[PDB]
RNA sequence: AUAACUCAAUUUGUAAAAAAGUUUUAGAGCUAGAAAUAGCAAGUUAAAAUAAGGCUAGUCCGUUAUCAACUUGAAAAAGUG
DNA sequence: CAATATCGTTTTTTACAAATTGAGTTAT
DNA sequence: AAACGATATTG
């Protein structure tokens, strides 16, 4: 009877139904409602359109913040309860006056002045401590009893903005010694390098190093004062290290191995060892003197103050900003009074402008302020331009860059103060430790929410049932159980033994397994032997003992040279399981050898269980203390020093397989586990896959007896949730396409699926740094410039030709080429991973393969550097060099040309497996599946070529029909292919010398559609002789369907979700639009929110009052039920509406009208709801095919003959231009009703009738955005911007007819809103 | 087409933290003038909220997914041409 | 009532598991 | 990152 074609997209599912002649049936569907019609004819073609599914990411970030906010509230709430009793004596109303600081005087309960509750004290406080940092410093330094209130403020400010937790352990501020500490580096160097000492030279390390520039410059500046020493010289890189940077010590010391050290990465103790153990331990006291100068200079850029003057150098640093800002602003006033007085009001009164007023009172950033007076200053000062570059000019203390500041330095003052004032307040002494905890304490990430079983999100497990707090957390939260659950709730079960947890990737047993499985198919021959042979049991264990347990990685060259030669005495050997080196390696054995320094223990086979628990622990837990905790049992087996280093050794990653599978389950026969068979299987050297599939053994069936919704099922898949929206809708479409054919399943279903600025500047910034290249500090760029492919590429290649070797010219990009590495005529990859910039695609070598071996030779060296500079990926590097493995074999070639029309994407196959198992559900007599329906899958190239080649052209911007057209051409091409070539079923249909013919064949698979290349009019399958294509009638019946104007389009109506409103918190204003940020906060006094999201409009017919007397008038209107209001409304719709003003509401006439709800009006004009307030265009323009194809060609400047018979088609049919405008205008005037817009278009067209046919078509294609279904949008007719006519009312709809559609549009229910 | 491993890149989902930003109030503006309006001085800080809120009352939850109509359902979802 | 213009919270860091794509080894 | 629905402003 029939087949179904689908096109699955993120915003659309197009569908078609086709009969055996490739025709698409029409049919009469019932039409429900209260209308004149009881039926309608509908062609079974259409498309569902829908807004994108969104990721949970924004939802998550909002969520994680919501919680940061409720918890910083409880921090202050902890602090305040401690203070309550002694503060209820100094000042009854203090913690209240704070609470209501936000209220206008009128709504206040206590005195307006928060701190002291009168004007004279409050005024005085502000005079003495302009900023809270003034108060922080005094409270830390001073010894005087201080006011409980001024103490409680300093403390809360520290707790309420406690800075970051990115450093572990304790930070101690101690500069002062920087000059002596630098001269200890220069001394404890010149000891070692006796020959060529560095002149300490009274060089000002102090200033150069604690200057306010970058690290990478403070370095240049410091080797600038050192004569005849390079910034890459040994002392050069030490200084980079002392400064916090990541330098590379390799070329100094002649190493083959990279030696980079970041003092404040957690592997520094292990990397320095790896170096020192290579260069000698007589260099320990050089990475020592560079650590000493590091601890005095770590926090330069935050501190800016000699810590000899104050235990409070962070606040002092801030008071410094204050004084400077004051000093500099006094001076900047004076200077403007003298020199540019006309412009003074502007700078200092005007908040509109980014003057000092716009800085302070407006909304102007430091950046925008600094951008405004750069000019003014130099047109006038010398010192202020110094400060503006440094970004140090009229600084505020609360700023975007305080993200540096660790919780440790604020804990610093927080501590100082308590110590100071516990001398006077007994309760600050008794509670000093509670209060540092509030600053200090932080729920560990591996615990998560502190839920009591109303958190979907939560997993932590309670050691008790009390309330958790920063002080009782250890004793009430079972942190270990939680830490474990954090990881184990996310890890895979062994798919094979689903009861069993996958082992740690780095499990000693796991690695043994991984090596054996790979060592059991290593073959080898000598000269003497008749055939290549597997390894013997005995051999493996000797290979494993001598090679795997002394080298991290074992080479084939080690195998030949180190085992065979020196244990077998073969001068020759030919190995056949591995290449170059062994994929598997006992990574963990050597980790543990280097640490437990006892070979005999790791081998000893009774230690197995323990060492498998040590690694599990090293993997489950990344908290070093908890690791210590877990490892405690075994303290007795290895020295103090050896536990200190086991705990630091952490692992991540999980296996794919369990312990039971590998070395647990036995063969009944053998009493041998898998690992036993890998370790020795005699003459057969069976491998895991095999072992699990050979019926000679117990294993396959020990496994088989261990095995096991739709919406749930689709959401559990792996891909964008955007495409998973398509997937559901495509299925739901298919079930209505089945219902519509009277519950008859198709013979066939055909599915095809479809496929910035910041991340690029970091890829280059980082790239060029590591490369030691001047190109940035020589042609600065910005984030948004690198969206130019050619510019991006130029910079990713160090301004250098990828195929030649020679600078390129930033000013000649437009003359050079973006060549594809593996050519575009194999791989339709057009990403950075397959593109290169070069002065011509020529220099590549052959058009017909990877870049030549000549080129690979010359360039390889550079490609490596770019690879090492993360300026090319491994994928790109590997393609680039592939010519030096014979490049593209005539079978790799064939490989890709099949890949071009065969879907390999996992997600598409998931789609097919679902549709198959849903269509095919009945079993035969021998009890295998009866496959009633074939699920064909197609790449999107087939139907695009098919469209190019027979001139069924597509132009997306005309209307939404092409989604449906593609799905029809998918059912057509799809069913034809597997009619003509039933053997391609193995490749396209879901379920269970030669290379050049595979190519030529797949290359040409689609020929049977054509009459010449000479093929017969009628095409047939040679075996069954069934008809597959009648070139004399079938191309005609395609052209019919394409030209068919009534195609079923349908926007998915959708209840809106997300933010209540816009986020912006607006000044006060009289306006019923404004929304209360909290119940008591009338926005007429406090400001608040505008722009709520309508979750859905709702038709109210009721009565409202009118005029002084409260005469009931009668109304029918659309009321927008906002997202906030939604839960209220649904709980009691009448009550909600009554309180809005409505009366005698007719509850049975209440229509939910989601976004997009459809309305047909007067001349088949349609509108779709956007809001209770604004309508969208609801009509499609059915442009004739002749005009579509005209517009394709015209706009598009085969070969010369056809690219001429189709250019002479354009010139001959130029009447089509005026005809196409005539079309848009009969439509626009019937349905769009944008008089002035239509008339600027008519005008716009007429002026440009004098311009090439190509140009005039490119821009008629833009005119369709006047006529496009959905929200109006701006477009240009040439240089004529035509702003959007919008429908800013929903009244006209209120007596129109509501159309309620099925997903397919086929079934309807039209209601005639005249009631 | 599947399975283990290797190397790289990506995607999805979760938790813990940070800095700003905004909004009201507080930080006595001053000297003229009846008045509207001038001149000058000031400005860097702070409290609080940061989805309204919710009952389950947790140092929890609140912006993802899912949604034609009619009948049936809490619901998912079924029945309906 | 209709044309036109303005508007939209931003950014950091740490820890982790899972698919998937695609170059390679070994296998059903 | 737009796009498009909410606002104010404006004619």
UniProtKB/Swiss-Prot annotation:
One of its GO terms (molecular function) is RNA binding. It is an enzyme of class 3 (hydrolase). Residues 756-901 form the HNH Cas9-type domain. Residues 1054-1315 are annotated as: PAM-interacting domain (PI). This is CRISPR-associated endonuclease Cas9/Csn1. Its EC number is 3.1.-.-. Has 2 endonuclease domains. The discontinuous RuvC-like domain (approximately residues 1-62, 718-765 and 925-1102) recognizes and cleaves the target DNA noncomplementary to crRNA while the HNH nuclease domain (residues 810-872) cleaves the target DNA complementary to crRNA. Has a bilobed architecture with a recognition lobe (REC, residues 60-718) and a discontinuous nuclease lobe (NUC, residues 1-59 and 719-1368). The crRNA-target DNA lies in a channel between the 2 lobes. Binding of sgRNA induces large conformational changes further enhanced by target DNA binding. REC recognizes and binds differing regions of an artificial sgRNA in a sequence-independent manner. Deletions of parts of this lobe abolish nuclease activity. It comes from Streptococcus pyogenes serotype M1. Changing residue 752 to A: Only cleaves 1 DNA strand, probably the noncomplementary strand. Processes guide RNAs correctly. In vivo, loss of Cas9-mediated CRISPR interference in plasmid transformation.
């Amino acid at each position: 009877k029939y087949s179904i074609g689908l096109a699955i997209g993120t915003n659309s599912v197009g569908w078609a139904v086709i009969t055996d002649e490739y025709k698409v049936p029409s049919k009469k569907f019932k039409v429900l409602g209260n209308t004149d019609r009881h039926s309608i004819k509908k062609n079974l073609i259409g498309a569902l359109l829908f807004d994108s599914g969104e990721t949970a990411e924004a939802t998550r970030l909002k969520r994680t913040a919501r919680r940061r906010y409720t918890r910083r509230k409880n921090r202050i709430c902890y602090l305040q309860e401690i203070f309550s009793n002694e503060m209820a004596k100094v000042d009854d109303s203090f913690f209240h006056r704070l609470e209501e600081s936000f209220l206008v005087e009128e709504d206040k309960k206590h005195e307006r002045h928060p701190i002291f509750g009168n004007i004279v004290d409050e005024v005085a406080y502000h005079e003495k401590y302009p900023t809270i940092y003034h108060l922080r410093k005094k409270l830390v330094d001073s010894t005087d009893k201080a006011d409980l209130r001024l103490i409680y403020l300093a403390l809360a400010h520290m707790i309420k903005f406690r800075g970051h937790f990115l450093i572990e352990g304790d930070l101690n501020p101690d500069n002062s010694d920087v000059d002596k500490l630098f001269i200890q580096l220069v001394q404890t160097y010149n000891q070692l390098f006796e020959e060529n000492p560095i002149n300490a030279s009274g060089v000002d390390a102090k200033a150069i190093l604690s200057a306010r520039l970058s690290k990478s410059r403070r370095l240049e500046n410091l080797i600038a004062q050192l004569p005849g020493e390079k910034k890459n010289g040994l002392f050069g890189n030490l200084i980079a290290l002392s400064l916090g940077l990541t330098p590379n010590f390799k070329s100094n010391f002649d190493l083959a191995e990279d030696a980079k050290l970041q003092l404040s990465k957690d592997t520094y103790d292990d990397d320095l060892d790896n170096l020192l153990a290579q260069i000698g331990d007589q260099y320990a006291d050089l990475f020592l003197a560079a650590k000493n100068l590091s601890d005095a200079i770590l926090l330069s850029d935050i501190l800016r103050v000699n810590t000899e003057i104050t235990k409070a150098p962070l606040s002092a640093s801030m008071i410094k900003r204050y004084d400077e800002h004051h000093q500099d602003l006094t001076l900047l006033k004076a200077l403007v009074r003298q020199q540019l007085p006309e412009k003074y009001k502007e700078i200092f009164f005007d908040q509109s402008k980014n003057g000092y007023a716009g800085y302070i009172d407006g909304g102007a950033s430091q950046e925008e302020f600094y951008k405004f007076i750069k000019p003014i200053l130099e047109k006038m000062t010398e010192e202020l331009l110094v400060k503006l570059n440094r970004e140090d000019l009229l600084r505020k203390q609360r700023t975007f860059d305080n993200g540096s500041i660790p919780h440790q330095i604020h804990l610093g003052e927080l501590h100082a103060i308590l110590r100071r004032q516990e001398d006077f307040y007994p309760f600050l002494k008794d509670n000093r430790e509670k209060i540092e905890k509030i600053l200090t304490f932080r729920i560990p990430y591996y615990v998560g929410p502190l839920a009591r079983g109303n958190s979907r999100f939560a997993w932590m497990t309670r050691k008790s049932e009390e309330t958790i707090t920063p002080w009782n957390f250890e004793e009430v939260v079972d942190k270990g159980a939680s830490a474990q659950s954090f990881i184990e709730r996310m890890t895979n079960f062994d798919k094979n033994l689903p009861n069993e947890k996958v082992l740690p990737k780095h499990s000693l047993l796991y690695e043994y397994f991984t090596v054996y499985n790979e060592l059991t198919k290593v073959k080898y021959v000598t000269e003497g032997m008749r055939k290549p042979a597997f390894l013997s049991g005995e051999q493996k264990k000797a290979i494993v003992d001598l090679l795997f347990k002394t080298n991290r990685k074992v080479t084939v060259k080690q195998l030949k040279e180190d085992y065979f030669k020196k244990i077998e005495c073969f001068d020759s050997v030919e190995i056949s399981g591995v290449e170059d080196r062994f994929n598997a390696s006992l990574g963990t054995y050597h980790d543990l050898l280097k640490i437990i320094k006892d070979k005999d223990f790791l081998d000893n086979e009774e230690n197995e269980d323990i060492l498998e628990d040590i690694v599990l622990t090293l993997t489950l837990f990344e908290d070093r203390e908890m690791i210590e905790e877990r490892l405690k049992t075994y303290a007795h087996l290895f020295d103090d020093k050896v536990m200190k280093q086991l705990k630091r050794r952490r692992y991540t990653g999980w296996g794919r397989l369990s312990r039971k599978l590998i070395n647990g389950i036995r063969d009944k026969q053998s009493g041998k586990t898998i690992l036993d068979f890998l370790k020795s299987d005699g003459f057969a050297n069976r491998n895991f896959m095999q072992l699990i599939h050979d019926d000679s053994l117990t294993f396959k069936e020990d496994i088989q007896k261990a095995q096991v919704s739709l919406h749930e099922h689709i959401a559990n898949l792996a891909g964008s949730p955007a495409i998973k929206k398509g997937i559901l809708q495509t299925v739901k479409v298919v079930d209505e396409l089945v219902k519509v054919m009277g519950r008859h399943k198709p013979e066939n279903i055909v599915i095809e699926m479809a496929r910035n600025s910041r991340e690029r500047m970091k890829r280059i910034e980082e790239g060029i740094k590591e490369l030691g290249s001047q190109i940035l500090k020589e042609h600065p760029v910005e984030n948004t410039q690198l969206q130019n492919e050619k510019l991006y590429l130029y910079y990713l290649q160090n301004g250098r030709d990828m195929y030649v070797d020679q600078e390129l010219d930033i000013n000649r990009l437009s003359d050079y080429d973006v060549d594809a590495i593996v050519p575009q005529s194999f791989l339709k990859d057009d990403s950075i991973d397959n593109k290169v910039l070069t002065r011509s695609d020529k220099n590549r070598g052959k058009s017909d393969n990877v870049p030549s071996e000549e080129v690979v030779k010359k360039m390889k060296n550079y490609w490596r550097q770019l690879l090492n500079a993360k300026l090319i990926t491994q994928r790109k590097f590997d393609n680039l060099t592939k010519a030096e493995r014979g490049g593209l074999s005539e079978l790799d070639k064939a490989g890709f040309i099949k890949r071009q029309l065969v879907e390999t994407r996992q997600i598409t196959k998931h789609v097919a497996q679902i549709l198959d198992s849903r269509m095919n559900t009945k079993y035969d007599e021998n009890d295998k599946l009866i496959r009633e329906v074939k699920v064909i899958t197609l790449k999107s190239k087939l139907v695009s070529d098919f469209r190019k080649d027979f001139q069924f052209y597509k132009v997306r911007e005309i209307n939404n029909y092409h989604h449906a057209h593609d799905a029809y051409l998918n059912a057509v091409v799809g069913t034809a292919l597997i009619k003509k070539y039933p053997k391609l079923e193995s490749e396209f249909v879901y379920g269970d010398g030669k290379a050049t013919a595979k190519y030529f064949f797949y290359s040409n698979i689609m020929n049977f559609f054509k009459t010449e290349i000479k093929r017969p009019l009628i095409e047939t399958n040679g075996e069954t002789g069934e008809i597959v294509w009648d070139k004399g009638r079938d191309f005609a019946t395609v052209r019919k369907v394409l030209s068919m104007p009534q195609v079923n389009i349908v926007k998915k109506t959708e209840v809106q979700t997300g933010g209540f409103s816009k986020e912006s918190i607006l000044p006060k204003r009289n306006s019923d639009k404004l929304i209360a940020r909290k119940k008591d906060w009338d926005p007429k006094k406090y400001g608040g929110f505008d722009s709520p999201t309508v979750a859905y409009s709702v038709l109210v017919v009721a009565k409202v009052e009118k005029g002084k007397s409260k005469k009931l008038k009668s109304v029918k209107e659309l009321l927008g039920i906002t997202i906030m209001e939604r839960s209220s409304f649904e709980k009691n719709p009448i009550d909600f509406l009554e309180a809005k003003g409505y009366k005698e509401v007719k509850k049975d006439l209440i229509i939910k009208l989601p976004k997009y709800s459809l309305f047909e009006l007067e001349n088949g004009r349609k509108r779709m709801l956007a809001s209770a307030g604004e309508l969208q265009k609801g009509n499609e323009l059915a442009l004739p095919s002749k005009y579509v194809n005209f517009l394709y060609l015209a706009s598009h400047y085969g070969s010369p003959e056809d690219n001429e018979q189709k250019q002479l088609f354009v010139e001959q049919h130029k009447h089509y231009l005026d005809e196409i405008i005539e079309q848009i205008s009969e439509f626009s005037k019937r349905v769009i009703l944008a008089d002035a817009n239509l008339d600027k278009v008519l005008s716009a067209y007429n002026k440009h009738r004098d311009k090439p046919i190509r140009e005039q078509a490119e821009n008629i294609i833009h005119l369709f955005t006047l006529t496009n279904l959905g929200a109006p949008a701006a477009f240009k007719y040439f240089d004529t911007t035509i702003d959007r006519k919008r429908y800013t009312s929903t009244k006209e709809v209120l007596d129109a007819t509501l159309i309620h559609q099925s997903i397919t549009g086929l079934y309807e229910t039209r209601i005639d809103l005249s009631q």
